[PDB]
Amino acid sequence: KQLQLAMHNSKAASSTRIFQALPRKLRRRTASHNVRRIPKRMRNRALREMRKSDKAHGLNAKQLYKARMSIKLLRLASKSTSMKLSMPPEVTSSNCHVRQKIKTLKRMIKESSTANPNIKLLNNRMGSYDCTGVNE
Amino acid sequence: KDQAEKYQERSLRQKYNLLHVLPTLNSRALSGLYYKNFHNSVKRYQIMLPEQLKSGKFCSHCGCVYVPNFNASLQLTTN
Amino acid sequence: MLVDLNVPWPQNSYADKVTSQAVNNLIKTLSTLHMLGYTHIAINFTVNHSEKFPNDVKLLNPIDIKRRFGELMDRTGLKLYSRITLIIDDPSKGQSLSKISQAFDIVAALPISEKGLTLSTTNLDIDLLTFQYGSRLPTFLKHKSICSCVNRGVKLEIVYGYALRDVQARRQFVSNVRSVIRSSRSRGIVIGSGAMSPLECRNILGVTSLIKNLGLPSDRCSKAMGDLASLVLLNGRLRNKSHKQTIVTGGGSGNGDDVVNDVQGIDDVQTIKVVKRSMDAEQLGHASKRHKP
Amino acid sequence: SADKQLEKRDYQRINKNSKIALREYINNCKKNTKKCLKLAYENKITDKEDLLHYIEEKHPTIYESLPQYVDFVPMYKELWINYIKELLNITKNLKTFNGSLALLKLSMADYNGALLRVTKSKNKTLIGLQGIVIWDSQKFFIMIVKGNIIDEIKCIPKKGTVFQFEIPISDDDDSALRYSILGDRFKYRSVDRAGRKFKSRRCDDMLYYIQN
RNA sequence: AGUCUCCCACCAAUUCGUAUGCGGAAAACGUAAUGAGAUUUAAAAAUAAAUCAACUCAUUAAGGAGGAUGCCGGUAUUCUGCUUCUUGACCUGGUACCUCUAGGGUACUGGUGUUCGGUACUGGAUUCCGAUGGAAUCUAAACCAUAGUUAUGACGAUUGCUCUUUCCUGGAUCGAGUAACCCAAUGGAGCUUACUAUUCUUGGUCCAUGGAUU
C-alpha cells in the first residue's frame, strides 16, 4: 500500500496526467445493496411443502405433477439464500435428504408411468434440432 | 392539568356511566354497541377484569350471541 | 374583512412605564385606522428572549385592552387583540414558551441567527414568523426549510413601515422582500404596518401599490390582509379557548358569534360563557317547523 | 388459572352481530317512516296522536316498529345531563370554576346521552337541526329527531359541521353554560386518559367557521 | 418532483434449470374470483371500526375429452379420466471403471451430517517476420441526444375555451379570466407523494342532507 509503487507505475506515463469522465453512453447507476426478495406465492408453497410430515402402487393420477413440483420446491428452498422462510425449516431439521431421494424421486414417479417411446436422446447436450413442416 | 390520583374519581364516574346504559332500555337487540364500548373502556384502563367469577362470565350477561343483558324471570329476545 | 396585524405598543421592555402622550398618539392613530376602514386591529409587543419575564403570571401583558380602550370600542365598534414578538438569538437560554403563550393571544418570534432560524421553523408553537427588514437578514433563505414550515401552522409577515422612514433602509427592504417572496414561493404571507404616527398609515388601495412593485401580484396581495390574517387570528385564539381545536368555549349561531368575532361576551378571566337557556328538549327539530326564535 | 384468555372468541362474534343488527334496525326505521307518511296524504290525520291510533288499528303489525322519540326522552337524556353536571362539579355558585380543565374533561367524555344542534356548516341545507344522539360513529352522528307528526332517525356527517350543546347550571333565572364542538378535529381526540400522537396541522379548511 | 425497487455482459448448470390463478425479461410491478381479519390481532396507531367502498391476508397449473344444470349440435355453469419430461440439493462413506500423473476424474449404492463460481475484450497511429498467423514501437482516448448542462429570452397579431351584460360544441353582441403544483443533468420500466378555495377545465357515485314528484 506504498505510493512508491504507484509512482513507479506512473513512470510509464507523464508526470500528472488527466483523464476524462466517461462518455454518457457507458455509465450506470448503483442498485440496492441488500439481497433480492422472493415472491410470496413461492414462499407459501415451499413452507407448506416442507412442513408436511412423512392399484399398482402407482395410483398417481394427477398426483405426478404434485410430486414433480414438490421436488422443485424442496430443491429451491434448500438451495437459495434469498429464501428466508422461518427459523425451524432447515435442510436437516426437516427430512430433505430422505425425502425426494429415497421417497419421491424413484419410488413414486419411476414406478407409475414407464418412460414413453422415442428415447432417442439427441446428438447434442444442448437442445438443438430442426422444426420444419414438409407441405404443412 | 390532572393531578396524581384525582383522576380516579373521573375514571370511576365514566365507568359508572358506561355501566348504567345497559340496565336502561335493554329491550332492544342493539345493546351490543354499548357492551362493546364498555369492554373497550375497561381494557383501556388496564384494570383487572371487573369482579369476575361473579358476573360477566357467561352468566347474568350476554344471553345469546349478542348482549341483551337478559332479565330475571327468564326474559330473552328469543332469536 | 380588513385587518392590520401590527401597531407598535410604545415600550422598550418590562423595565420602563409608558407616558401618556404615547397613549394619546396611539388613540389618534387607532381612530385614523378605523377611519380608513379597518375592522380588527392587533397591538404588537417586542421583547427579547434573553430577559426575565416577571414571576407573577398576572402581569405578563400590560396592554389591558378591556379597560384602556373601552370608549373607542364603544363608539367605533372596533375589535382589539394583543400580540407578542420575541427576539431569538441563541437557544439554550431558558424561558420556555409555556406561560407566555398563556396570557397572550398571538405569539411570534423573529430570529437573528443561524441557530434561531433553525429553531424557529421546525420545533416551536409560534404562529407568525417575522424578520427584521431594516438590516441584513441572518442567512440565505434555504428553499426547503421555509416551504416546509408553511405546511404547519406558521406564516410570514411583511411590514411596510420601513419603506417610508429613511433612505438607506429602503434598499435593504427591497432586497430582503425580494428574497423572502423568492424563497417562500409566495404562498403564506400576511402584511402589517408598523406605523408610529397617523402620517404613516395607508389604506387597501395604497398598500397594494408598493407591494405589487416588488413582484407579488394583485389578487394575492388583496388576500394578504384578508382571510389569511383572519386564519392567523383563528389559530391564535384557538389556543386558550380549546384543548386541541376540538372543544371550544364559544357561542351559538347569528352573524358575528364565534371565538374571534366575540370579544366582550366571553369572560376571559374564567373562560366561560353564561347564556340565556332558550333552547330545550321539547321543541321541534327543524328550522321553520318551529317558529319562535 | 382463572383468566380464561380464550373467552375473547365471543367478543369477535358480539362485535360481528352488532354491526349487522344496527344496519337492519336503521333501514327498518327509515322504511317504516317512509311507508307510514304516505298514508297521511290519502287521509286527513295530521297530528302526532291520531296517526298512532290509525296505524295501530289499520296496519297494526308495523306499529311496534317506530321510533317514538318520547321513549328516548324521559331519562335517557333528561336524567343523564346530571352525569356531566356531576362530572365537572357544577353548582349554583360557580366562582370555584376552572376553565381549561373542564375543557380537558369534556374532550374525553361519552356523548351518547346528549342533545345536539347544528349551528354552522359547509352545507347550508342542514342548519338548525336539533336531535338526541344514540350512537356516535367515527364518520357520523346518529340521532333521533322529533318531527311535526312523525319522528325520524338522522345520520349527519362530522366533516364540515359545528355543533353546540347547553348545560343547565342552577335555579337562578334559568341560566346555563354553552359549549361548541367542531367537526374536522374530532376523530383525533383521546377517548380516555390516553394521549395520542397529537400532531400539528393547518387551518385553511376551517374558513367557514369565521366566514361571516 | 423522491432517504424507493428493477434492467442496461454470457451461462445445458457451485449462475435464483422458478412449469406454481393471469400479464411481465425482471420489479418495495399490474390485475380476476372466492373468503376472512384489525393493538381481544398474521400485523399498523393508545387504512377501517352502522351498510357499500378503502387497508391487509389466505386459497386457486394450461390444454383437451366425457356426463349433467339453463336456453335454442351449440354456449355459461358443474364432477371424472388423459397428454405434456434435459437421469439436477450441499457435505460425505463404499465398489466397479478411466485414453488422466502411490494421487485425480466417471458410473451403481448407502448416512441426517444477508452479497463469495468460470470464461472475455481499451481507442488511434507507425513498424517487423518463409500470413484466415505471429511480433515490436509511439500516442492519448473511448465526447455521444429531433431540450441537452444548471441556457429554454424580450414582445406583437388572430382563433379556441369558461363565465357574463343584451339579444335572434345553435348565431350575433357588452365585459372579465386562460390558473394551481412546479422544472430537466446518462437513459428506460415501475411505484410513492404535491395541485386545479362564484381564481383555467371534464366525468361519475352516494342504504349523505333539504325541497318537489307521487
Numbering used by the authors:
A (entry chain B): 71 to 124, 138 to 219
B (entry chain K): 3 to 81
C (entry chain J): 1 to 293
D (entry chain D): 68 to 279
Text from the published report:
Ribonuclease (RNase) MRP, a site-specific endoribonuclease, is a ribonucleoprotein complex (RNP) comprising a catalytic RNA moiety and multiple (ten in Saccharomyces cerevisiae) protein components. Known RNase MRP functions include its participation in the maturation of rRNA and in the metabolism of specific mRNAs involved in the regulation of the cell cycle. RNase MRP appears to have split from the RNase P lineage early in the evolution of eukaryotes, acquiring distinct substrate specificity and cellular functions. S. cerevisiae RNase MRP and RNase P share eight proteins (Pop1, Pop3, Pop4, Pop5, Pop6, Pop7, Pop8, and Rpp1 (two copies)); RNase MRP protein Snm1 has a homolog in RNase P (Rpr2), while Rmp1 is found only in RNase MRP.
